Structure formats: C-alpha cells, structure tokens
Amino acid sequence: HMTIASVPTSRYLSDMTLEEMSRDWFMLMPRQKIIGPLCVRLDQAIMEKNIVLKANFSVIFNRLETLILLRAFTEEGAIVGEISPLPSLPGHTYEDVKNAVGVLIGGLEWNGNTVRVSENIQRFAW
C-alpha cells in the first residue's frame, strides 16, 4: 500500500460488505443534518443500544481521501444512521469527515446509545 515505487497507491478500505453497502434501510423517526459537503442521517427511535460505526472509504498514502459511506449498526446488524456525500459530490476532506462523525456520534449519544467505531474509522476518520 506504500511500497510500490514512484506512484501513490490508493486503497479502498471497507468495514461494510457490499450487501451492507447497498442494503436499503428505513428510519422510523428521521433526524438529518447537512454538515458541509456531507449528509448525516440518524434514526431517533434508537435508544440505549450498543452501536458500532462502520465506514468504507478511499485512502491515499496513509490519509483518508474520500468517504464513500459510513453506517451505524446495532449488535443485531440493523442500520440506524448514516453519513454520505451530497448528491452533487462536492469534494470533501478528512476535517469534513471528522466533523460529520462527531455529529453522528453526538446524535446517537443524546439518545443514550453507546457508540464504538471501527479500527479503520479510529485510524483515518476520528
């Protein structure tokens, strides 16, 4: 991922399987914020659950370059929140991704959820 000579290697790091990525999901009580070039969505009808954040993103060298998608999951595997780029694909940075994550986590914690993040998120996005 950084041995190859003379060119930068891009990587797609994936916490979520294809199935998880394209799975369609629904929120009973949608809460949504636009945070710069990213969209944060949260189901407010989720409380006091253990939640994990999983993200699929593009890294260049050893820095997050592009968030493709992030979703929050219950232990049972259900999707309760999400961060994605705006439809216009505005271009965004690590700082943008970090802020959006802080917001999603904040929203979850206001509902008394216990939130953990994947190693990859911890390494590149948080």
Letters for 41-60 (x = contact with a copy of itself by CB under 8 A, - = none) are -x------------------
Among 20, 86, 99, 126, binds a copy of itself (CB under 8 A): 99
Among 102, 116, 122, 123, binds a copy of itself (CB under 8 A): 102
- CB distance 83 to 100 below 8 Å: yes
Binding positions for a copy of itself, 9-28, rule CB under 8 A: none
Shortest distance, CB of residue 84 to a copy of itself, whole angstroms?
17
Rounded distance, CA 91 to CA 57, Å? 13
φ and ψ at 100, to 5 degrees? -70, -40
Burial class (CB in 10 A: 0-12, 13-18, 19+), 93: middle
Name the amino acid, one letter, at 2: M
118, two tokens: 């994947």
Site membership for a copy of itself, residue 106 (CB under 8 A): yes
Shortest distance, CB of residue 11 to a copy of itself, whole angstroms?
29
Q: Which residues bind a copy of itself (CB under 8 A)?
A: 33, 35, 42, 99, 102-112
